[PDB]
Amino acid sequence: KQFAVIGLGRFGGSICKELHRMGHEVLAVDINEEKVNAYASYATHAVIANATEENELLSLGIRNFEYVIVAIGANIQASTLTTLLLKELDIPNIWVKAQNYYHHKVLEKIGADRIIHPEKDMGVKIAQSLSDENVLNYIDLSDEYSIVELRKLDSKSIIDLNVRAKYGCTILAIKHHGDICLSPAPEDIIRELVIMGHKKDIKRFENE
């Protein structure tokens, strides 16, 4: 697996450092010299290049990468022309960071395999946490079912609450001072909690 990350910003630079940490060959490309110097130690290869130029793109041997990530999300012209070149160069997987809804529509027309909205996805997740302070993190399995990680419940056993049949929801795990429990069989004392169930049913448990 050889990965190319084009554009070293907050999003693109984070991908380079994480992939390099996992032990992958990463080519970091950016048009700004200061960015490339900073990430020269966090990538296998770091090049100062303009990704909108076909000659510079071919000078990098970009055809040797299965995955190319275009992490340019504030320059629509630079973002769309880069992915147009990569599609012309027959890159199998092209993942692009989109700016707005109109940028997303263009990238879908010119063939971006995956389109990413980092700030928009995080903003929705943060806004869910703001609305319900109990909700610490959640993953949306579907449009009606989700897994949500959450003093009345304190000193209460699992068998004490019958939300297993009352709400049709299952308690996946409970965190006890840095200790996790898998398949918690009642009864277990709840101290001052991961649950999977229907989205409406989960809200019922938070109420009671």
Ligand X SMILES: Nc1ncnc2c1ncn2[C@@H]1O[C@H](COP(=O)(O)OP(=O)(O)OP(=O)(O)O)[C@@H](O)[C@H]1O
- Subset of 2-31 contacting a second copy (CB under 8 A): 3, 9-15, 17-19, 22, 24
CB-based contact 82:106 (threshold 8 Å): no
**Residue 184: CB minimum distance to a second copy, A:** 11
Question: Is 8 near ligand X (CB under 6 A)?
Answer: yes
CA separation for the pair 119, 112 (Å, rounded): 19
User: For a second copy, which residue of 44, 47, 120, 188 counts as binding (CB under 8 A)?
Assistant: 120
Q: Provide the minimum distance between the beta carbon of 146 and ligand X in the complex, in angstroms, as a whole number.
A: 25
Residue 135: name its binding partner from a second copy, ligand X, none (Cβ under 5 to 8 Å by kind).
none
Q: Does 42 bind ligand X (CB under 6 A)?
A: no
Task: Decide if residue 127 touches a second copy (CB under 8 A).
Answer: yes
From the list a second copy, ligand X, none, partner contacted by residue 8 (C-beta under 5 to 8 A by kind):
ligand X
Selected range binding a second copy among 57-65, 152-160, 180-188, rule: CB under 8 A: 180-188
Q: Is 89 in the site for a second copy (CB under 8 A)?
A: no
The answer to whether residue 10 forms part of the interface with ligand X (CB under 6 A) is: yes
Residue closest to 7 by CA, chosen among 137, 98, 126, 138: 98
Selection from 51, 45, 54 nearest residue 69 by Cα: 51
Helix, strand, or coil (residue 142): coil
Q: Does 39 bind a second copy (CB under 8 A)?
A: no
Tokens of 62: 């970009």
Site for a second copy (CB under 8 A): which residue of 173, 188, 199, 204? 173
C-alpha to C-alpha distances, 73 to 35, 112, 185, nearest whole angstrom: 16, 14, 47
Across the strands, what pairs with 170? 196
Residue 12, C-beta contacts closer than 8 angstroms, at least 6 positions apart? 5, 6, 28, 30, 69, 71, 72, 97
Taking the mean position of all CA atoms in its chain, how far away is CA 62?
A: 24
Identify residues after which the chain is interrupted (C–N over 2.5 A).
150, 192
Could you say which of ligand X, a second copy, none residue 89 binds, taking C-beta under 5 to 8 angstroms by partner kind? none
Answer yes or no whether residue 11 interacts with ligand X by CB under 6 A. yes
User: Residues at the annotated binding site?
Assistant: 10, 30-32, 50-51, 72-74, 97-99, 103, 119
